[PDB]
Amino acid sequence: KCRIEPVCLLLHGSPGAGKSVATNLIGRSLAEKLNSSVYSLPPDPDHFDGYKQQAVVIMDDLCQNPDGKDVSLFCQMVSSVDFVPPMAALEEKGILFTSPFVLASTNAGSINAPTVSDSRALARRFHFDMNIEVISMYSQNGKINMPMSVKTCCPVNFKKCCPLVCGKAIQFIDRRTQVRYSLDMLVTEMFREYNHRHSVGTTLEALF
Numbered sequence: 001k002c003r004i005e006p007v008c009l010l011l012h013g014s015p016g017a018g019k020s021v022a023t024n025l026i027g028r029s030l031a032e033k034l035n036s037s038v039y040s041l042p043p044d045p046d047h048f049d050g051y052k053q054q055a056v057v058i059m060d061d062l063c064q065n066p067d068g069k070d071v072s073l074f075c076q077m078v079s080s081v082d083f084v085p086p087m088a089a090l091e092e093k094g095i096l097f098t099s100p101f102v103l104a105s106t107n108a109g110s111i112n113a114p115t116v117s118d119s120r121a122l123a124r125r126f127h128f129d130m131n132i133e134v135i136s137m138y139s140q141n142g143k144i145n146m147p148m149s150v151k152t153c154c155p156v157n158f159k160k161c162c163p164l165v166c167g168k169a170i171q172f173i174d175r176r177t178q179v180r181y182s183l184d185m186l187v188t189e190m191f192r193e194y195n196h197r198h199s200v201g202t203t204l205e206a207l208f
């Protein structure tokens with residue numbers, strides 16, 4: 001346990017609910033706070049082609065019934081263990097996974113791991129576990145309207161505001177408590193959690 005655990009978000013939404021744009025805006029806002037960038041993890045087995053310790057890793061379109069290999073990898077990523085992603089297949093040197101944020105999205109209502117033990121392990125890692133709701137005036141034919149939603153309407157974590165950012169077009173609902181957030185509010189909550197985990201007091205508390 002030498003690593004601070006990444007702060008992890010899981011977004012559940014129907015197809016066309018804006019999941020991919022939401023994770024890429026949340027990730028870019030967080031990544032810029034850390035003077036870094038976003039990396040989308042390839043879904044295929046050697047998942048880390050292009051990984052350069054970017055501050056934000058995104059996993060889009062998680063399936064409802066993941067492979068044991070996928071569960072295993074995810075549980076390593078979102079933990080305090082030092083580990084080297086599978087890079088030998090890419091003929092690239094082993095580098096440590098050090099990204100402090102992991103964002104994922106799924107069309108599944110609930111992720112079912114192979115065993116209930118694995119389901120518990122996933123649940124303790126999805127620190128922010130949120131449902132996406134698209135507001136009906138910003139959706140047509142089940143698809144979020146991006147021109148409408150990005151048109152400039154101030155926000156805390158973005159330069160300009162738009163319906164996507166301030167909760168007019170898309171909202172996030174906490175799956176446990178039903179508390180509701182805009183995208184802007186969610187970035188604040190996630191960065192606050194990152195600061196909590198890196199604070200001196202928190203890291204010292206772990207010595208007892």
Ligand SMILES: CNCC[C@H](Oc1ccc(C(F)(F)F)cc1)c1ccccc1
Nearest residue numbers: 042043059060061062063066070071074
């Ligand atoms: C074959 N297509 C799905 C492969 C895989 O799906 C996953 C689904 C769930 C998880 C979990 F649960 F977070 F571990 C991890 C991966 C995935 C999805 C997106 C990015 C990397 C891996």
Ligand code: NA
Nearest residue numbers: 126127128193
């Ligand atoms: Na948490």
Ligand code: NA
Nearest residue numbers: 136137139140
């Ligand atoms: Na509509």
Ligand SMILES: [Zn+2]
Nearest residue numbers: 153161162166
């Ligand atoms: Zn706005």
